[PDB]
Ligand binder design. Structure first.
Ligand SMILES: CCCCCCCC/C=C\CCCCCCCC(=O)O[C@H](COC(=O)CCCCCCC/C=C/CCCCCCCC)COP(=O)(O)OCCN
Lengths: 71, 83
C-alpha cells in the first residue's frame, strides 16, 4: 500500500538539450594565407637561384677537367 | 577605368582560377624583358665549354690571344664567382 512508483522526470526539470547547428568559423583570412604562400615561393626561388648558380660553376669546373684530359 | 574595375571584381568573385591564370601568364610574358639578369643567363650559357677549344696558329700578330691558359689575356670568369 506504499506510494505509487512510476518512471517519471526528476523534481523541477531535466537539463536543457542542445539542438541547433554548431559550426565554428575556425580559420585565418584569405590575405594571410596568400601572403604566406607567396613568401614561401619567393624564399624557395632565391634558394634555388643560389644553388643553381653554384651547380653551374661546378659543371664548368668538371668540363675544364675534361678539356685538360682530352689531348 | 570604372567599368573594368567592376569587371575585375566580378571575375575575382566568379572565376578566381582564370584571374590567377591570366595574371601569372601576363607576369611571365612581361617580366623577362625587364630583368637585368637575362643577359647574365646568356653569358652563363656562353661560358659553358662543351667542346675542346682548338688553338690558333701563331702568326706573330695576335697580342690579344694568350700563349698559356694562365696568361692575363683572354676572357675572364671572375664575374661568375661573384654571383
Ligand atoms: C596575358 C597573357 C595570357 C596568357 C596567360 C594565360 C594562360 C592560359 C589561360 C587561358 C586559358 C583559356 C581561358 C579560358 C576562357 C574561359 C571562357 C569562358 O567561357 O568563361 C566562363 C566564365 O566567365 C568568364 O569569362 C570569367 C571572367 C572573365 C575571364 C576571367 C578573367 C579574365 C582576365 C581577368 C584578369 C586579367 C589580369 C589580372 C589582373 C589582376 C588585377 C589586379 C567559363 O565558365 P563556364 O564553364 O561557361 O560556366 C558554365 C556553368 N554555368
Amino acid at each position: 500500500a506504499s506510494k505509487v512508483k512510476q518512471d517519471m522526470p526528476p523534481p523541477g526539470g531535466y537539463g536543457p538539450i542542445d539542438y541547433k547547428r554548431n559550426l565554428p568559423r575556425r580559420g585565418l583570412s584569405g590575405y594571410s594565407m596568400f601572403a604566406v604562400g607567396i613568401g614561401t615561393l619567393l624564399f624557395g626561388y632565391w634558394s634555388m637561384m643560389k644553388w643553381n648558380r653554384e651547380r653551374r660553376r661546378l659543371q664548368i669546373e668538371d668540363f675544364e677537367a675534361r678539356i685538360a684530359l682530352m689531348p | 577605368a570604372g567599368r573594368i574595375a567592376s569587371f575585375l571584381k566580378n571575375a575575382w568573385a566568379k572565376e578566381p582560377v582564370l584571374v590567377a591564370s591570366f595574371a601569372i601568364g601576363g607576369l611571365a610574358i612581361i617580366l623577362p624583358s625587364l630583368s637585368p639578369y637575362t643577359n647574365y643567363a646568356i653569358r652563363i650559357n656562353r661560358a659553358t665549354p662543351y667542346n675542346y677549344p682548338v688553338p690558333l696558329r701563331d702568326d706573330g700578330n695576335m697580342p690579344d690571344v694568350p700563349s698559356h691558359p694562365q696568361d692575363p689575356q683572354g676572357p675572364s670568369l671572375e664575374w661568375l664567382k661573384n654571383l
